[PDB]
Amino acid sequence: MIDLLQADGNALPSAVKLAYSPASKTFESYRVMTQVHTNDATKKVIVKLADTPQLTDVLNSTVQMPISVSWGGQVLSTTAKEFEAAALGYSASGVNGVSSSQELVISAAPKTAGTAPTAGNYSGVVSLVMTLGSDNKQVEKNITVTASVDPVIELLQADGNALPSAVKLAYSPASKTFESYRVMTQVHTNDATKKVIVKLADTPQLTDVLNSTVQMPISVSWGGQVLSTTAKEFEAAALGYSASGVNGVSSSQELVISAAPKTAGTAPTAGNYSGVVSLVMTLGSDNKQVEKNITVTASVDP
Amino acid sequence: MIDLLQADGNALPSAVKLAYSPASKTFESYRVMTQVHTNDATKKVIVKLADTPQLTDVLNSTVQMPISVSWGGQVLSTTAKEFEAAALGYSASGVNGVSSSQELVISAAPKTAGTAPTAGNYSGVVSLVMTLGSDNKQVEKNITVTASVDPVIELLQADGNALPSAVKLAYSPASKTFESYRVMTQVHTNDATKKVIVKLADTPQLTDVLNSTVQMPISVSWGGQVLSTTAKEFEAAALGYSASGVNGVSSSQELVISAAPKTAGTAPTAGNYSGVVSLVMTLGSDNKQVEKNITVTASVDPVILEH
C-alpha cells in the first residue's frame, strides 16, 4: 500500500543520534534521502506528524527542546501537507512504484533560539505518518531521537579571561599585614539549576622559601563565603543566573586571597614566600568539577 | 645636588603613553633605565611619590585606575623608601657622581581585577620625588601618564555564539506566508553609556535565484523595532546594561527576519529565493561598527503543496 525507505532501498533507522558540539552549542541535524514506495501513483501523498516531537531530559520532564522535521522541502507538523503525485515524480521505468529522492531532516535546538541547551540526556520520537487520499492506506515510521549535552563548568574572570595561575600579595610594613588579592569571577555552566559546591583541596600556606618551618596561613573567600577543606554549597538562585540575560553565566563573584600570621601581632619573618591555593568547584550531582591552582607569592621587607 | 636622568644621559620624558592590550584587558608598562646624578655619591637616596597617581577618565571623574610606579626594584608610594648609596653602586671613574642603571616602571591596571575598564581617555601625573640625606634639598620629576581604552562593540547570540551566516525561512502554503526567523542576541560593549545605532546597509530582498526581476521584501526587526536603511537609535539605559550583573552586556534582544509576498493573498512565484541582510550596528559618536551579513534563503512550493 505505502512505505518510505532510504533512497538506497535500505530501511529507515529506528533510532537516530544528534551529535552535539560544545563549541557551537548546537545539534547537527539528521539528514537522509528517502523514497516513497506505493501501489498507487495517482493519489496525493498526505504527510504529517502523529504528535509534536520533543526532546525531553531523560531525568527531568520540564526540560524540553522542540524537534523540527522536514520532508521534501516542507516543514512537517500535526497538520497534514499534501504532495501532488506528479510532483513526487514516480518511476515505472524498471522500479515501478517509487518516488524521486526527498530529503528527511530531523533537527533539534532550544525553544528560545540563541540560548544554550541544558546539560542532560534527551529522548524523544518522530512519528512520521504517510497516507494516500486519507482512509487507512497508511504507514507510521517512528524514529527514536536521542541527544547528549555533557555537564560543563568553567570559572573565569568576569571579563572572560582565564584566572591567574600566579598572584602576588603586597606587604604593608606599617600595619605588618598583607593587602588582599581580589578578582571578579563568573561561573559558566551548562546546568544552571544545580548547587555549586566550593572547597579547597588542601589548606593553603605561604611558606618561607628558605625556612620550611616559617609558614603563614592563607585565607580564601568566594562569593562572600570563607572557604576551607569542608565544602560550602551555593544555591543556584543565590548566584544570579537569568533566563533572559547572559544565559548560563552567574553574576560576578569576588575571589579574595589573603595572608596573615596564625596569631595577630606577630612580626612576619623577612623573606620571600610561596604557596598554592587549589580551588575546587563542583556541579552538584553531575560528576563535574573545575580545579584552579593559584601560586601565591609575597615578600616581607623591613 | 640631586637629579635623575635616562641611562643614556638624556632627560626623562615629561609625558608617557600606555599601550593597552584589548586581549588581556591590561596596559603595557613603560620601562626606562635611569641613573641618579649627585654631588654626594655616598649618602641615602630617599625615593617617594608626592601624590597617589590615578588615571582618571578625562570626561568623567568617577572612573579611576591606579598607577604603579617602581624604581630600583621597589614599588613606590607616598611613604618614602631609602636606598643605601653603596647599593646604587656609584661610579667616579670618569663619570664623577653617577649610579648604576636602575629601572623606572610606570604601570596601571583596571580599578577592579577581572573587570574590563570603560572606553575613554585617561590622564594622570606621576610626581616622583628624590631627596639627599632627607634634608632641605630635592628634585621633583613629573611624568604625565595618559592611556586610551578604545571603544569596542560585538553583537552575539545570547549564549555567546556568533550570529548565523545563513537563514532558511519556511513557507506555509495554507496562510501563504513565511515563518519568521527568530534569534536572541546581546550587544557586548565597553562603551556602555553610548547610543547603539542600528540600520540595514542595503534594502534586503529575496530574489529568485535564476531570475532577478522576481523578488519579495525581507523585513528585519531588532530589539522590537523595524529596521531600515535609515538608522534607528537605541538609548543605552533602554538596552538593560548593569553596573553589577554581567558587565558590558545588554539584556537579550530578539532579531527577527521575515518575508512577505509582493501582493498579499497571492502565492509567491514557485522557485528558490536568496538575499542578504546586512545588519550594521554602530556605537553612538564613536567609529566603531559591527556588520553581520546574513544570507536568507527560501523555497516556495504553492499549488504543488496543500494545507
Side-chain angles (χ1 to χ4, degrees), chain A residues 24 74 80-82 84 113-114 157-159 161 182-184 186 244-246, chain B residues 23 25 113-114 157-159 161 170 182-184 186 246 252 301 304-307:
Chain A
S24 76
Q74 290 305 298
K81 286 185 165 164
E82 329 169 345
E84 311 268 68
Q157 290 183 41
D159 61 20
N161 258 43
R182 286 173 214 277
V183 75
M184 279 308 178
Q186 283 169 337
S244 270
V246 200
Chain B
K25 281 98 182 179
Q157 296 192 39
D159 67 351
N161 293 165
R182 285 179 227 267
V183 69
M184 290 310 219
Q186 306 192 290
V246 187
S252 243
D301 46 278
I304 313 305
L305 258 125
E306 291 109 296
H307 116 273

PDB file of all heavy atoms in Angstrom, chain A residues 24 74 80-82 84 113-114 157-159 161 182-184 186 244-246, chain B residues 23 25 113-114 157-159 161 170 182-184 186 246 252 301 304-307:
ATOM      1  N   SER A  24      29.939  25.024  19.365  1.00  0.00           N
ATOM      2  CA  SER A  24      28.883  25.789  18.713  1.00  0.00           C
ATOM      3  C   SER A  24      27.553  25.729  19.481  1.00  0.00           C
ATOM      4  O   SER A  24      26.602  26.430  19.130  1.00  0.00           O
ATOM      5  CB  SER A  24      28.704  25.330  17.252  1.00  0.00           C
ATOM      6  OG  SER A  24      28.012  24.085  17.171  1.00  0.00           O
ATOM      7  N   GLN A  74       9.542  20.535   2.990  1.00  0.00           N
ATOM      8  CA  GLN A  74       8.378  21.003   3.724  1.00  0.00           C
ATOM      9  C   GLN A  74       8.509  20.667   5.208  1.00  0.00           C
ATOM     10  O   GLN A  74       8.665  19.501   5.576  1.00  0.00           O
ATOM     11  CB  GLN A  74       7.100  20.351   3.158  1.00  0.00           C
ATOM     12  CG  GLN A  74       6.716  20.816   1.810  1.00  0.00           C
ATOM     13  CD  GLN A  74       6.574  22.343   1.726  1.00  0.00           C
ATOM     14  OE1 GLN A  74       5.702  22.958   2.422  1.00  0.00           O
ATOM     15  NE2 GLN A  74       7.507  22.974   1.002  1.00  0.00           N
ATOM     16  N   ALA A  80      -1.529  18.112   8.247  1.00  0.00           N
ATOM     17  CA  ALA A  80      -1.052  17.351   7.125  1.00  0.00           C
ATOM     18  C   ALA A  80      -0.745  18.278   5.957  1.00  0.00           C
ATOM     19  O   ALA A  80      -1.429  19.289   5.762  1.00  0.00           O
ATOM     20  CB  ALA A  80      -2.102  16.314   6.738  1.00  0.00           C
ATOM     21  N   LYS A  81       0.349  17.986   5.264  1.00  0.00           N
ATOM     22  CA  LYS A  81       0.651  18.578   3.966  1.00  0.00           C
ATOM     23  C   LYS A  81       0.431  17.541   2.939  1.00  0.00           C
ATOM     24  O   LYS A  81       0.749  16.378   3.162  1.00  0.00           O
ATOM     25  CB  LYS A  81       2.093  19.087   3.919  1.00  0.00           C
ATOM     26  CG  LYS A  81       2.291  20.348   4.707  1.00  0.00           C
ATOM     27  CD  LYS A  81       3.655  20.931   4.590  1.00  0.00           C
ATOM     28  CE  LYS A  81       3.642  22.395   5.115  1.00  0.00           C
ATOM     29  NZ  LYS A  81       5.013  22.927   5.389  1.00  0.00           N
ATOM     30  N   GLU A  82      -0.170  17.944   1.822  1.00  0.00           N
ATOM     31  CA  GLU A  82      -0.383  17.072   0.682  1.00  0.00           C
ATOM     32  C   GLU A  82       0.566  17.371  -0.472  1.00  0.00           C
ATOM     33  O   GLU A  82       0.604  18.488  -0.982  1.00  0.00           O
ATOM     34  CB  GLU A  82      -1.838  17.148   0.180  1.00  0.00           C
ATOM     35  CG  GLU A  82      -2.902  17.431   1.247  1.00  0.00           C
ATOM     36  CD  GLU A  82      -4.267  17.765   0.669  1.00  0.00           C
ATOM     37  OE1 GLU A  82      -4.350  18.068  -0.545  1.00  0.00           O
ATOM     38  OE2 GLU A  82      -5.270  17.718   1.427  1.00  0.00           O
ATOM     39  N   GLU A  84       1.149  16.521  -4.385  1.00  0.00           N
ATOM     40  CA  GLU A  84       0.614  16.004  -5.668  1.00  0.00           C
ATOM     41  C   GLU A  84       1.516  14.893  -6.211  1.00  0.00           C
ATOM     42  O   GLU A  84       2.759  14.989  -6.116  1.00  0.00           O
ATOM     43  CB  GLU A  84       0.421  17.137  -6.721  1.00  0.00           C
ATOM     44  CG  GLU A  84      -0.335  18.362  -6.196  1.00  0.00           C
ATOM     45  CD  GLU A  84      -1.856  18.294  -6.433  1.00  0.00           C
ATOM     46  OE1 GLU A  84      -2.541  17.437  -5.797  1.00  0.00           O
ATOM     47  OE2 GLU A  84      -2.380  19.132  -7.226  1.00  0.00           O
ATOM     48  N   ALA A 113      15.532  30.431  20.543  1.00  0.00           N
ATOM     49  CA  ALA A 113      16.739  30.356  19.705  1.00  0.00           C
ATOM     50  C   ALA A 113      17.759  31.414  20.087  1.00  0.00           C
ATOM     51  O   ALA A 113      17.387  32.525  20.476  1.00  0.00           O
ATOM     52  CB  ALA A 113      16.394  30.454  18.231  1.00  0.00           C
ATOM     53  N   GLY A 114      19.032  31.019  20.084  1.00  0.00           N
ATOM     54  CA  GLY A 114      20.116  31.831  20.636  1.00  0.00           C
ATOM     55  C   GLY A 114      20.531  31.473  22.064  1.00  0.00           C
ATOM     56  O   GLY A 114      21.453  32.088  22.625  1.00  0.00           O
ATOM     57  N   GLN A 157      37.567  34.811  35.037  1.00  0.00           N
ATOM     58  CA  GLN A 157      37.452  36.249  35.330  1.00  0.00           C
ATOM     59  C   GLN A 157      36.183  36.795  34.709  1.00  0.00           C
ATOM     60  O   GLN A 157      35.766  36.349  33.632  1.00  0.00           O
ATOM     61  CB  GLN A 157      38.650  37.029  34.795  1.00  0.00           C
ATOM     62  CG  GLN A 157      39.976  36.793  35.521  1.00  0.00           C
ATOM     63  CD  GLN A 157      41.126  37.672  34.974  1.00  0.00           C
ATOM     64  OE1 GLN A 157      40.939  38.859  34.679  1.00  0.00           O
ATOM     65  NE2 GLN A 157      42.304  37.082  34.845  1.00  0.00           N
ATOM     66  N   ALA A 158      35.574  37.757  35.399  1.00  0.00           N
ATOM     67  CA  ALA A 158      34.334  38.374  34.953  1.00  0.00           C
ATOM     68  C   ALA A 158      34.419  39.037  33.528  1.00  0.00           C
ATOM     69  O   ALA A 158      33.410  39.095  32.811  1.00  0.00           O
ATOM     70  CB  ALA A 158      33.834  39.352  36.012  1.00  0.00           C
ATOM     71  N   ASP A 159      35.639  39.393  33.094  1.00  0.00           N
ATOM     72  CA  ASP A 159      35.909  39.855  31.710  1.00  0.00           C
ATOM     73  C   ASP A 159      36.079  38.738  30.644  1.00  0.00           C
ATOM     74  O   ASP A 159      36.196  39.034  29.428  1.00  0.00           O
ATOM     75  CB  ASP A 159      37.088  40.868  31.671  1.00  0.00           C
ATOM     76  CG  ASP A 159      38.415  40.281  32.185  1.00  0.00           C
ATOM     77  OD1 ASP A 159      38.670  39.059  32.262  1.00  0.00           O
ATOM     78  OD2 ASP A 159      39.315  41.085  32.533  1.00  0.00           O
ATOM     79  N   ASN A 161      38.473  36.417  30.620  1.00  0.00           N
ATOM     80  CA  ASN A 161      39.848  35.928  30.663  1.00  0.00           C
ATOM     81  C   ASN A 161      40.010  34.834  31.701  1.00  0.00           C
ATOM     82  O   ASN A 161      39.222  34.749  32.660  1.00  0.00           O
ATOM     83  CB  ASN A 161      40.820  37.077  30.948  1.00  0.00           C
ATOM     84  CG  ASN A 161      41.557  37.580  29.678  1.00  0.00           C
ATOM     85  OD1 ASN A 161      40.964  37.750  28.593  1.00  0.00           O
ATOM     86  ND2 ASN A 161      42.845  37.885  29.844  1.00  0.00           N
ATOM     87  N   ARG A 182      42.063  40.483  45.114  1.00  0.00           N
ATOM     88  CA  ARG A 182      40.631  40.473  44.792  1.00  0.00           C
ATOM     89  C   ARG A 182      40.470  40.436  43.287  1.00  0.00           C
ATOM     90  O   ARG A 182      40.936  41.354  42.592  1.00  0.00           O
ATOM     91  CB  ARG A 182      39.972  41.714  45.310  1.00  0.00           C
ATOM     92  CG  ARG A 182      39.773  41.748  46.761  1.00  0.00           C
ATOM     93  CD  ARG A 182      39.258  43.077  47.246  1.00  0.00           C
ATOM     94  NE  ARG A 182      39.778  43.418  48.559  1.00  0.00           N
ATOM     95  CZ  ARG A 182      39.271  42.983  49.709  1.00  0.00           C
ATOM     96  NH1 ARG A 182      38.228  42.152  49.721  1.00  0.00           N
ATOM     97  NH2 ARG A 182      39.813  43.379  50.856  1.00  0.00           N
ATOM     98  N   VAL A 183      39.841  39.352  42.783  1.00  0.00           N
ATOM     99  CA  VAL A 183      39.477  39.218  41.371  1.00  0.00           C
ATOM    100  C   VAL A 183      38.030  38.856  41.223  1.00  0.00           C
ATOM    101  O   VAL A 183      37.505  38.074  42.018  1.00  0.00           O
ATOM    102  CB  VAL A 183      40.444  38.236  40.556  1.00  0.00           C
ATOM    103  CG1 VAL A 183      40.181  36.755  40.874  1.00  0.00           C
ATOM    104  CG2 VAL A 183      40.349  38.492  39.027  1.00  0.00           C
ATOM    105  N   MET A 184      37.361  39.520  40.272  1.00  0.00           N
ATOM    106  CA  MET A 184      35.959  39.292  39.986  1.00  0.00           C
ATOM    107  C   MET A 184      35.835  38.116  39.063  1.00  0.00           C
ATOM    108  O   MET A 184      36.646  37.950  38.148  1.00  0.00           O
ATOM    109  CB  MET A 184      35.333  40.529  39.360  1.00  0.00           C
ATOM    110  CG  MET A 184      34.929  41.620  40.366  1.00  0.00           C
ATOM    111  SD  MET A 184      33.878  41.020  41.730  1.00  0.00           S
ATOM    112  CE  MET A 184      33.672  42.567  42.744  1.00  0.00           C
ATOM    113  N   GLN A 186      33.231  34.765  37.304  1.00  0.00           N
ATOM    114  CA  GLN A 186      31.932  34.213  36.944  1.00  0.00           C
ATOM    115  C   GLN A 186      32.041  32.738  36.660  1.00  0.00           C
ATOM    116  O   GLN A 186      32.973  32.310  35.998  1.00  0.00           O
ATOM    117  CB  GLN A 186      31.385  34.936  35.722  1.00  0.00           C
ATOM    118  CG  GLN A 186      30.811  36.317  36.011  1.00  0.00           C
ATOM    119  CD  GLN A 186      30.527  37.123  34.760  1.00  0.00           C
ATOM    120  OE1 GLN A 186      31.120  36.887  33.687  1.00  0.00           O
ATOM    121  NE2 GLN A 186      29.630  38.082  34.890  1.00  0.00           N
ATOM    122  N   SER A 244      16.868  35.275  30.708  1.00  0.00           N
ATOM    123  CA  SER A 244      16.582  36.354  29.717  1.00  0.00           C
ATOM    124  C   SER A 244      17.749  37.390  29.569  1.00  0.00           C
ATOM    125  O   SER A 244      17.612  38.404  28.857  1.00  0.00           O
ATOM    126  CB  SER A 244      15.246  37.069  30.045  1.00  0.00           C
ATOM    127  OG  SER A 244      14.144  36.442  29.397  1.00  0.00           O
ATOM    128  N   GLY A 245      18.879  37.110  30.230  1.00  0.00           N
ATOM    129  CA  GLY A 245      20.099  37.893  30.080  1.00  0.00           C
ATOM    130  C   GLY A 245      21.233  37.082  29.469  1.00  0.00           C
ATOM    131  O   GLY A 245      21.102  36.567  28.341  1.00  0.00           O
ATOM    132  N   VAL A 246      22.375  37.064  30.165  1.00  0.00           N
ATOM    133  CA  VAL A 246      23.585  36.345  29.713  1.00  0.00           C
ATOM    134  C   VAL A 246      23.524  34.888  30.194  1.00  0.00           C
ATOM    135  O   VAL A 246      24.014  34.552  31.288  1.00  0.00           O
ATOM    136  CB  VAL A 246      24.926  37.068  30.154  1.00  0.00           C
ATOM    137  CG1 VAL A 246      26.115  36.614  29.287  1.00  0.00           C
ATOM    138  CG2 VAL A 246      24.774  38.562  30.066  1.00  0.00           C
TER     139      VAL A 246
ATOM    140  N   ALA B  23      43.104  42.355  24.296  1.00  0.00           N
ATOM    141  CA  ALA B  23      43.027  40.915  24.516  1.00  0.00           C
ATOM    142  C   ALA B  23      43.162  40.562  26.006  1.00  0.00           C
ATOM    143  O   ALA B  23      42.281  39.893  26.566  1.00  0.00           O
ATOM    144  CB  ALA B  23      44.073  40.173  23.659  1.00  0.00           C
ATOM    145  N   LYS B  25      43.183  42.803  28.493  1.00  0.00           N
ATOM    146  CA  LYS B  25      42.487  43.880  29.244  1.00  0.00           C
ATOM    147  C   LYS B  25      43.381  44.678  30.242  1.00  0.00           C
ATOM    148  O   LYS B  25      42.869  45.376  31.150  1.00  0.00           O
ATOM    149  CB  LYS B  25      41.170  43.374  29.884  1.00  0.00           C
ATOM    150  CG  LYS B  25      39.988  43.266  28.899  1.00  0.00           C
ATOM    151  CD  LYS B  25      39.811  41.832  28.388  1.00  0.00           C
ATOM    152  CE  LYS B  25      38.692  41.732  27.381  1.00  0.00           C
ATOM    153  NZ  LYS B  25      38.555  40.337  26.878  1.00  0.00           N
ATOM    154  N   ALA B 113      40.015  44.038  39.546  1.00  0.00           N
ATOM    155  CA  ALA B 113      40.607  42.927  38.780  1.00  0.00           C
ATOM    156  C   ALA B 113      39.527  41.976  38.283  1.00  0.00           C
ATOM    157  O   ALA B 113      38.523  41.750  38.976  1.00  0.00           O
ATOM    158  CB  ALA B 113      41.639  42.177  39.618  1.00  0.00           C
ATOM    159  N   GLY B 114      39.734  41.450  37.071  1.00  0.00           N
ATOM    160  CA  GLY B 114      38.738  40.666  36.346  1.00  0.00           C
ATOM    161  C   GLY B 114      37.622  41.477  35.702  1.00  0.00           C
ATOM    162  O   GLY B 114      36.649  40.908  35.205  1.00  0.00           O
ATOM    163  N   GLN B 157      24.948  36.026  19.587  1.00  0.00           N
ATOM    164  CA  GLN B 157      23.824  35.263  20.149  1.00  0.00           C
ATOM    165  C   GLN B 157      23.876  35.315  21.657  1.00  0.00           C
ATOM    166  O   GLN B 157      24.936  35.576  22.224  1.00  0.00           O
ATOM    167  CB  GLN B 157      23.844  33.825  19.654  1.00  0.00           C
ATOM    168  CG  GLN B 157      23.636  33.672  18.127  1.00  0.00           C
ATOM    169  CD  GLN B 157      23.361  32.234  17.700  1.00  0.00           C
ATOM    170  OE1 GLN B 157      22.653  31.500  18.386  1.00  0.00           O
ATOM    171  NE2 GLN B 157      23.814  31.880  16.503  1.00  0.00           N
ATOM    172  N   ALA B 158      22.718  35.152  22.304  1.00  0.00           N
ATOM    173  CA  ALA B 158      22.592  35.296  23.778  1.00  0.00           C
ATOM    174  C   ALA B 158      23.460  34.317  24.570  1.00  0.00           C
ATOM    175  O   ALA B 158      23.903  34.638  25.677  1.00  0.00           O
ATOM    176  CB  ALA B 158      21.121  35.177  24.215  1.00  0.00           C
ATOM    177  N   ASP B 159      23.703  33.137  23.990  1.00  0.00           N
ATOM    178  CA  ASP B 159      24.620  32.138  24.542  1.00  0.00           C
ATOM    179  C   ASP B 159      26.118  32.381  24.238  1.00  0.00           C
ATOM    180  O   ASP B 159      26.977  31.616  24.680  1.00  0.00           O
ATOM    181  CB  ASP B 159      24.188  30.709  24.133  1.00  0.00           C
ATOM    182  CG  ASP B 159      24.331  30.434  22.624  1.00  0.00           C
ATOM    183  OD1 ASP B 159      24.592  31.297  21.752  1.00  0.00           O
ATOM    184  OD2 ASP B 159      24.116  29.262  22.233  1.00  0.00           O
ATOM    185  N   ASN B 161      27.562  32.415  21.171  1.00  0.00           N
ATOM    186  CA  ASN B 161      27.822  32.047  19.769  1.00  0.00           C
ATOM    187  C   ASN B 161      27.830  33.261  18.860  1.00  0.00           C
ATOM    188  O   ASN B 161      27.124  34.240  19.122  1.00  0.00           O
ATOM    189  CB  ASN B 161      26.750  31.085  19.233  1.00  0.00           C
ATOM    190  CG  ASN B 161      26.770  29.723  19.893  1.00  0.00           C
ATOM    191  OD1 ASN B 161      25.798  28.971  19.754  1.00  0.00           O
ATOM    192  ND2 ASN B 161      27.879  29.368  20.581  1.00  0.00           N
ATOM    193  N   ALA B 170      10.870  29.130   6.279  1.00  0.00           N
ATOM    194  CA  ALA B 170       9.888  28.136   5.829  1.00  0.00           C
ATOM    195  C   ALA B 170       8.688  28.867   5.308  1.00  0.00           C
ATOM    196  O   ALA B 170       8.312  29.932   5.842  1.00  0.00           O
ATOM    197  CB  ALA B 170       9.494  27.211   6.961  1.00  0.00           C
ATOM    198  N   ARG B 182      13.656  33.786  14.216  1.00  0.00           N
ATOM    199  CA  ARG B 182      13.904  34.479  15.467  1.00  0.00           C
ATOM    200  C   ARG B 182      15.165  33.968  16.119  1.00  0.00           C
ATOM    201  O   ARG B 182      15.378  32.760  16.195  1.00  0.00           O
ATOM    202  CB  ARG B 182      12.705  34.305  16.410  1.00  0.00           C
ATOM    203  CG  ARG B 182      11.523  35.143  16.009  1.00  0.00           C
ATOM    204  CD  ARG B 182      10.314  34.970  16.899  1.00  0.00           C
ATOM    205  NE  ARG B 182       9.103  34.795  16.089  1.00  0.00           N
ATOM    206  CZ  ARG B 182       8.283  35.777  15.706  1.00  0.00           C
ATOM    207  NH1 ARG B 182       8.507  37.045  16.075  1.00  0.00           N
ATOM    208  NH2 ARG B 182       7.195  35.477  14.996  1.00  0.00           N
ATOM    209  N   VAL B 183      15.973  34.897  16.628  1.00  0.00           N
ATOM    210  CA  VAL B 183      17.112  34.588  17.491  1.00  0.00           C
ATOM    211  C   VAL B 183      17.349  35.674  18.579  1.00  0.00           C
ATOM    212  O   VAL B 183      17.234  36.870  18.321  1.00  0.00           O
ATOM    213  CB  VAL B 183      18.410  34.306  16.647  1.00  0.00           C
ATOM    214  CG1 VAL B 183      18.944  35.572  15.939  1.00  0.00           C
ATOM    215  CG2 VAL B 183      19.476  33.604  17.485  1.00  0.00           C
ATOM    216  N   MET B 184      17.659  35.217  19.782  1.00  0.00           N
ATOM    217  CA  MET B 184      18.092  36.074  20.866  1.00  0.00           C
ATOM    218  C   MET B 184      19.566  36.480  20.727  1.00  0.00           C
ATOM    219  O   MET B 184      20.448  35.624  20.449  1.00  0.00           O
ATOM    220  CB  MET B 184      17.814  35.423  22.228  1.00  0.00           C
ATOM    221  CG  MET B 184      16.337  35.341  22.603  1.00  0.00           C
ATOM    222  SD  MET B 184      15.431  36.937  22.416  1.00  0.00           S
ATOM    223  CE  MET B 184      14.300  36.891  23.967  1.00  0.00           C
ATOM    224  N   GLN B 186      22.761  39.520  22.068  1.00  0.00           N
ATOM    225  CA  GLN B 186      23.202  40.522  23.041  1.00  0.00           C
ATOM    226  C   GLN B 186      24.318  41.373  22.481  1.00  0.00           C
ATOM    227  O   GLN B 186      25.183  40.879  21.712  1.00  0.00           O
ATOM    228  CB  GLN B 186      23.630  39.863  24.360  1.00  0.00           C
ATOM    229  CG  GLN B 186      22.581  38.962  24.973  1.00  0.00           C
ATOM    230  CD  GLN B 186      22.874  38.556  26.383  1.00  0.00           C
ATOM    231  OE1 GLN B 186      23.797  37.776  26.647  1.00  0.00           O
ATOM    232  NE2 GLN B 186      22.040  39.001  27.285  1.00  0.00           N
ATOM    233  N   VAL B 246      26.286  40.922  34.567  1.00  0.00           N
ATOM    234  CA  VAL B 246      27.337  40.626  33.558  1.00  0.00           C
ATOM    235  C   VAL B 246      27.698  41.888  32.758  1.00  0.00           C
ATOM    236  O   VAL B 246      26.978  42.288  31.821  1.00  0.00           O
ATOM    237  CB  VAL B 246      27.004  39.381  32.627  1.00  0.00           C
ATOM    238  CG1 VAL B 246      28.216  39.025  31.705  1.00  0.00           C
ATOM    239  CG2 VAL B 246      26.582  38.131  33.467  1.00  0.00           C
ATOM    240  N   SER B 252      18.887  40.530  26.541  1.00  0.00           N
ATOM    241  CA  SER B 252      18.596  39.846  25.302  1.00  0.00           C
ATOM    242  C   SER B 252      17.734  40.649  24.368  1.00  0.00           C
ATOM    243  O   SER B 252      16.796  41.309  24.788  1.00  0.00           O
ATOM    244  CB  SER B 252      17.962  38.502  25.586  1.00  0.00           C
ATOM    245  OG  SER B 252      18.812  37.470  25.098  1.00  0.00           O
ATOM    246  N   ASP B 301       6.642  26.762  -2.882  1.00  0.00           N
ATOM    247  CA  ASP B 301       6.100  25.456  -3.165  1.00  0.00           C
ATOM    248  C   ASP B 301       4.534  25.539  -3.199  1.00  0.00           C
ATOM    249  O   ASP B 301       3.870  24.701  -2.582  1.00  0.00           O
ATOM    250  CB  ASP B 301       6.555  24.496  -2.055  1.00  0.00           C
ATOM    251  CG  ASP B 301       6.385  25.108  -0.637  1.00  0.00           C
ATOM    252  OD1 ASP B 301       7.264  25.893  -0.205  1.00  0.00           O
ATOM    253  OD2 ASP B 301       5.401  24.865   0.095  1.00  0.00           O
ATOM    254  N   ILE B 304       1.678  22.968  -5.915  1.00  0.00           N
ATOM    255  CA  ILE B 304       2.394  21.703  -5.638  1.00  0.00           C
ATOM    256  C   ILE B 304       2.063  21.111  -4.229  1.00  0.00           C
ATOM    257  O   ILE B 304       2.060  19.866  -4.053  1.00  0.00           O
ATOM    258  CB  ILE B 304       3.966  21.925  -5.798  1.00  0.00           C
ATOM    259  CG1 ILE B 304       4.341  22.701  -7.103  1.00  0.00           C
ATOM    260  CG2 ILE B 304       4.767  20.590  -5.654  1.00  0.00           C
ATOM    261  CD1 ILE B 304       3.803  22.087  -8.516  1.00  0.00           C
ATOM    262  N   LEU B 305       1.751  22.008  -3.268  1.00  0.00           N
ATOM    263  CA  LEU B 305       1.581  21.653  -1.863  1.00  0.00           C
ATOM    264  C   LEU B 305       0.419  22.333  -1.183  1.00  0.00           C
ATOM    265  O   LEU B 305       0.226  23.542  -1.318  1.00  0.00           O
ATOM    266  CB  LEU B 305       2.869  21.872  -1.087  1.00  0.00           C
ATOM    267  CG  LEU B 305       3.547  20.537  -0.876  1.00  0.00           C
ATOM    268  CD1 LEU B 305       4.974  20.530  -1.376  1.00  0.00           C
ATOM    269  CD2 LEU B 305       3.428  20.119   0.589  1.00  0.00           C
ATOM    270  N   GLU B 306      -0.313  21.551  -0.396  1.00  0.00           N
ATOM    271  CA  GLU B 306      -1.646  21.921   0.093  1.00  0.00           C
ATOM    272  C   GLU B 306      -1.717  21.771   1.623  1.00  0.00           C
ATOM    273  O   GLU B 306      -1.164  20.828   2.171  1.00  0.00           O
ATOM    274  CB  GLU B 306      -2.724  21.044  -0.587  1.00  0.00           C
ATOM    275  CG  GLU B 306      -2.922  21.303  -2.084  1.00  0.00           C
ATOM    276  CD  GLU B 306      -2.396  20.169  -2.988  1.00  0.00           C
ATOM    277  OE1 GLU B 306      -1.159  19.908  -3.006  1.00  0.00           O
ATOM    278  OE2 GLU B 306      -3.209  19.599  -3.757  1.00  0.00           O
ATOM    279  N   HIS B 307      -2.273  22.794   2.287  1.00  0.00           N
ATOM    280  CA  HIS B 307      -2.908  22.705   3.642  1.00  0.00           C
ATOM    281  C   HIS B 307      -2.016  22.266   4.815  1.00  0.00           C
ATOM    282  O   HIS B 307      -1.198  23.053   5.322  1.00  0.00           O
ATOM    283  CB  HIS B 307      -4.295  21.990   3.603  1.00  0.00           C
ATOM    284  CG  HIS B 307      -4.360  20.694   4.370  1.00  0.00           C
ATOM    285  ND1 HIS B 307      -4.018  19.478   3.810  1.00  0.00           N
ATOM    286  CD2 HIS B 307      -4.864  20.411   5.596  1.00  0.00           C
ATOM    287  CE1 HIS B 307      -4.260  18.511   4.678  1.00  0.00           C
ATOM    288  NE2 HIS B 307      -4.758  19.052   5.776  1.00  0.00           N
TER     289      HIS B 307
END
